[PDB]
Structures are given as structure tokens and as C-alpha cells.
Paper text:
The PIN (PilT N-terminus) domain is a small domain with ~ 130 amino acid residues and is widely distributed in all three kingdoms of life. Utp24 is the endonuclease proposed to cleave the A1 and A2 sites. Depletion of Utp24, aka Fcf1 (Faf1 copurifying factor 1), inhibits cleavage at sites A0, A1 and A2 in yeast, whereas mutations of the active site of Utp24 specifically block cleavage at sites A1 and A2, but not at site A0. This suggests that Utp24 plays both a structural and catalytic role in 90S.
In this study, we determined a crystal structure of the PIN domain of Utp24 from Schizosaccharomyces pombe. The crystal belongs to space group C2221 and contains one molecule in the asymmetric unit. The structure was determined with molecular replacement using the Utp23 structure as search model and refined to an Rfree/Rwork of 0.287/0.222 at 2.14 Å resolution. Although the full-length protein of spUtp24 was used in crystallization, the crystal structure contains only the PIN domain (residues 60–192). The N-terminal region was not resolved likely due to flexibility or degradation. The structure adopts a compact three-layer fold with a mixed six-strand β-sheet packed by helices α1-α4 at one side and helices α5 and α6 at the other side. A zinc ion is coordinated with Cys103, Cys132, His134 and Cys142, which are invariant in Utp24 orthologues.
Author numbering: 60 to 192
Write the structure that this text describes.
């Protein structure tokens, strides 16, 4: 029910993991999912990219590409991990792309939210179905 127009919420560091592994975000997500995939970026994830500066410069530009869908934040100017977790609790129409061990263990509590991570020169499906309370 997630689609085969797939919506993938990007966390703050995911693009950087992609750049480190010589992965093009867009092709990598498309290849991982075998269908049109839409990378998504919340307002406050986008603000961190503005804020953290030099080593997120190339991430910032990539995040401003046409193919990104921007997700407005209906919350106070806050917390990138909490932002994703709150969004995928309301709307189960999302995947989460993160290599962050703590965010993943929070997402694994939420049924139905697949996790993608960068590994071995590809984006892989890290969490397919299983819940860990
Ligand atoms: Ca969309
Ligand atoms: Zn937010």
C-alpha cells in the first residue's frame, strides 16, 4: 500500500552516506525499489542542512533538486529524529532512509514503516516488516 510511486523520508545524514559510497541518491533509491521513488525532506531536516554548513553543502544542493518533495512541518521548529517519527506515526505512506542506529530502533517500534540504509555501494532494505518493541 506504500505505492509504486514510493515516498522515502530522508534523514539529515543519509545523502552524506550516499556521497561517501559513490551512490547517486535518485538512481540508488529507484534501483533499490524497482520503481519510481520520491525522496522527501521535512522542513526541519532541511534547516539542519542549512545550519551544519561545510560538510553538508553538497547535501543541501542535492536536497533542493526538483525531484525532492518538500514536507511542511506542522510542528514548532524542532528535532529531526522526532520529526520523522511523528510523521510516520500519523501517515503510514512512507519509507525512512537512515543509517542512524538510534532513529532506526525508534522506527522499528512502528509497524509498517520500511527502513532503507546505505551499505555495500547500494541502498538496501534494512527493515522490511518486523517490529521490535
Ligand atoms: Ca508525493
Ligand atoms: Zn519537522
Amino acid at each position: 500500500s506504500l505505492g509504486p510511486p514510493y515516498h522515502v523520508i530522508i534523514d539529515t545524514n543519509f545523502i552524506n552516506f550516499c556521497l561517501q559510497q559513490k551512490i547517486d541518491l535518485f538512481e540508488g533509491l529507484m534501483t533499490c525499489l524497482y520503481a519510481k521513488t520520491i525522496p522527501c525532506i521535512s522542513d526541519c531536516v532541511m534547516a539542519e542542512l542549512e545550519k551544519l554548513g561545510i560538510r553538508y553543502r553538497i547535501a543541501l544542493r542535492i536536497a533542493k533538486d526538483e525531484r525532492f518533495e518538500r514536507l511542511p512541518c506542522t510542528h514548532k521548529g524542532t528535532y529531526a529524529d522526532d520529526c520523522i517519527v511523528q510523521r510516520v506515526m500519523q501517515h503510514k505512506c512512507y519509507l525512512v532512509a537512515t543509517n542512524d542506529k538510534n532513529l532506526k530502533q525508534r522506527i522499528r517500534k512502528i509497524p509498517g514503516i520500511p527502513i532503507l540504509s546505505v551499505a555495500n555501494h547500494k541502498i538496501r532494505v534494512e527493515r522490511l516488516v518486523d517490529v521490535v518493541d
